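Homework-ish question, so no full write-ups if that breaks the rules, but can someone show me the predicted structure for this set?
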Amino acid sequence: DEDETTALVCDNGSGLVKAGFAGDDAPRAVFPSIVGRPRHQGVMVGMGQKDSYVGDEAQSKRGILTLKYPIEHGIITNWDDMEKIWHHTFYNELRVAPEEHPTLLTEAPLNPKANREKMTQIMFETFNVPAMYVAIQAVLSLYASGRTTGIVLDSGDGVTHNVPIYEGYALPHAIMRLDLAGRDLTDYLMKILTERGYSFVTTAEREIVRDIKEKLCYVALDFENEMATAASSSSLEKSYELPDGQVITIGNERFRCPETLFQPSFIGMESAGIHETTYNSIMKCDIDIRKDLYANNVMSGGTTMYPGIADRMQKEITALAPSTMKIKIIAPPERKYSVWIGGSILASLSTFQQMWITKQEYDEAGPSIVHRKCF
Amino acid sequence: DDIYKAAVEQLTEEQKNEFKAAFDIFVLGAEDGCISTKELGKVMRMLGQNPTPEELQEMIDEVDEDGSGTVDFDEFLVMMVRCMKDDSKGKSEEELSDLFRMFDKNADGYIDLDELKIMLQATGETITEDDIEELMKDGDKNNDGRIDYDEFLEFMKGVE
Amino acid sequence: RQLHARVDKVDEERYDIEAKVTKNITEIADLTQKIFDLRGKFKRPTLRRVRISADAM
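A: Not a homework solution, just the prediction itself:
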């Protein structure tokens, strides 16, 4: 349907998959990384009804489905379900056949090896894609943001990777990776709202809480002052409408959940928080690198859309940083949608045509080729 | 009379002879049209149907378009070809399928009035907006403003 | 021998177009199956002979 064998770009995370073609500005469609399955016995006959549902089908029919995510903390653990998600992504909504297009997939630099290897195998064996590449999330964010140097703090649904990059090169000894993510904030919000009389323990309830989080929650610039008021007055509560007509209001819980990014102890995690790890990613780099990383804190990934987060991340690191020097945050309206955007940019670069793995080299090496050719 | 073309062309003669065989009850013999529109219900039943009487009175008003009270061959055989499409069936959906995807050479999922008018003027037939509109909403019974695949099949169905 | 290579690869290619139209046919079957579902939702309730013994006696 395209006038060129443009690469397909699929930003497959632990949240939603954003997909479209290289050279465009935006994904053609977005899909929950979900395969749904009925938890009930059918009663009426000739009702259609699938054994399993994919993406938005799984979410739309969720009233009686248990919903599973094949990707956890950035890694595919269930590749049969990813084959279904990709079939849907490519043939039902983008309506393209990867057999005629190179495909670009994304991951964090320390994502366990099985992820990129199984992603490579699925696209070469079930879709028979002519070429593959698995790209770095930080690289993709840097292209989207217009930078070659900076800290990419990618606090999304799966993991926070936090990798410093200078002149387009990794500074791997300074990756302050953290097992704290948007999915934990969602789990925390389900629990804290349960305490308000609105229990959220089932799949339908979990999807509702994620929707509540995305629309009602924030981190603010000053937690203690924000809570001093939110805990004292109803003036800071915000309502939300649930699908069945219930109305829930959230007070200080509205920010106490999200605050776990700065205070991980709220969910039992042992961590300094995302702002200290951002600071250390800069500090652990050489002294002639530090000045450029301080001036370029690059925000990407999920959770970047919480009110007060860009302002707060700059405040928290500038407060740890030395005086005289200027410390700055980069947080464009392209935040979180930067990995997909970077995929489009990267896939299309003329210099990247030497990075793509072809369905030639693949057959001689097998999917393990991804560890020889990508990064 | 032009709808008689769909009445007889897609149908056959011996179909009309079997109509005569099922009809010869009211005309007991050697007569020339003594049939009335009341027992139209009876005469359609003996053809093997499972109808409703509201549709009996409908056909009674779906005929007598000339105000006669008695039924003519064209519109009756047609209401059959409109309901009892016991015709030469008019087409195949491989033939009609290629018809669609050639009209809709784009395979839009629907022959809009675009390709509809395209081929209606490729006919050489003078084709107005009313022409494509009747043809469309006969296909696009959905009245979505565009003939889809089976809309185009049903549309071009029973046609010469 | 050029022909032998040609027939090797073109046997491959006709088998491949075979499998391609086979997938086209399989997806015709499956999409037209969910379409059987769609249109059945609409047309099944009348696949029945009704109002026969209501009055005849």
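Now go work out the reasoning yourself. Hint: The radius of gyration of chain C is 25 Å.
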